[PDB]
């Protein structure tokens, strides 16, 4: 109900986020897609698992 | 029964919070909305998988 | 079937416990209440996640 | 199928287990009780939440 | 929705992919096959459990 | 659908394994049997559970 809106808004919005692991690794870069279990991010996309996700920052406020 | 109401207690009563996250690190803010899997946690709002948390700590006691 | 009853055995005795989390963290105090996902254990109560508990361990015995 | 059957053995027979957790602890006692999600381990019992367990070891082989 | 045809492409095109583990871990190989909860990454296929990826990395771009 | 055959393959051929947890420990034996939570690896059988294997790594190629 708020995951879903948040992570469309980024990706519509094309923000750059940063996605932090649970193992403490920082990701960057624009979300291009997500569903149920993983979120894209866009050299290539990588596919990452949610469960391995602590938190998603956007660079800047986003309408949500 | 009792994740929701404690949630939306600090939620409305706009408490400071430490959110412990299971890899040891400790987010500070104000809970601005929460759903099913995630807590946004107000620079920007950060997104929260519940699944990274380990413990929520009121910055003082609330009423649930 | 034996979660529950133990749980509510430490919350109605209010037997002080120890709450290891799988992080190695100890966490000590009451059981105030809980339900399907998280303890609430009392300077504030704090919500424990149970996907973050590894051991709860009763400081003296408790008929369950 | 095997886990229920597998658990009640060392249960019933009383067998002294090592319990090791998935942060590299290891617990040691006998199974008192289980249930979908924790395993009782018995100076007190300590409620042992399945998804912190990697290995249950026996002491000694097992009827099952 | 987006990772079963992320990781058919992967699989279809056999692209080299790098699988990134919670424990941080980096497996390589490519996709031989995959279901709900596991990869099958090819000296041998290895059998990967969702649950301990973090993220999969394709070498190149790919249609998806 | 792969994760099923290719446990039962590497059972019914008695094929030795590794099991490789998300803590870093290496397991090695025989699979005995496995069942949707578990796999029972053969001085005695210990019980796994598949939430803490990140991969299982077969010696040699099996079918499946
Ligand atoms: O409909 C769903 C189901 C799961 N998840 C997230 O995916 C995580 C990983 O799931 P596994 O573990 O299952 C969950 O803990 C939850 O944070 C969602 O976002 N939406
Ligand atoms: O209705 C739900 C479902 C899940 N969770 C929490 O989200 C965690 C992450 O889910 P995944 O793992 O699934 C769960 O272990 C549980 O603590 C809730 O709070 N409410
Ligand atoms: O009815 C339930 C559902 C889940 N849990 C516990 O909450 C944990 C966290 O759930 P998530 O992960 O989902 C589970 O692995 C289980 O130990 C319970 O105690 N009771
Ligand atoms: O009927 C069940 C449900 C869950 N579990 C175990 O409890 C773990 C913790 O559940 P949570 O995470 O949910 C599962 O991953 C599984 O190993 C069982 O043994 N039996
Ligand atoms: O239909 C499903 C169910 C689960 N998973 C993934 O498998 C993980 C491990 O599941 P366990 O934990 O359950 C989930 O968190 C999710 O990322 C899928 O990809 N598809
Ligand atoms: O039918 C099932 C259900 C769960 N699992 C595996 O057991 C793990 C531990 O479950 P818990 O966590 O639940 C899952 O993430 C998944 O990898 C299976 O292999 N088959």
Same mark, same amino acid.
């Given at each position: 109900? %708020?995951?879903?809106?948040? %992570?469309?808004?980024?990706? *519509? !919005? *094309? @923000?750059? @986020?940063? &996605?932090?692991?649970?193992?403490?690794?920082?990701?960057?870069?624009?979300? !291009?897609?997500?569903?149920?279990? $993983?979120? %894209? %991010?866009?050299? $290539?996309?990588?596919? #990452?698992?949610? +469960?391995? &996700? /602590?938190?998603? @920052?956007? /660079? *800047?406020? #986003?309408? +949500?």
């Amino acid at each position: 109900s %708020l995951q879903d809106p948040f %992570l469309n808004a980024l990706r *519509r !919005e *094309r @923000v750059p @986020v940063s &996605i932090y692991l649970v193992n403490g690794i920082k990701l960057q870069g624009q979300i !291009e897609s997500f569903d149920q279990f $993983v979120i %894209l %991010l866009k050299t $290539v996309s990588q596919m #990452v698992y949610k +469960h391995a &996700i /602590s938190t998603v @920052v956007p /660079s *800047r406020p #986003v309408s +949500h």
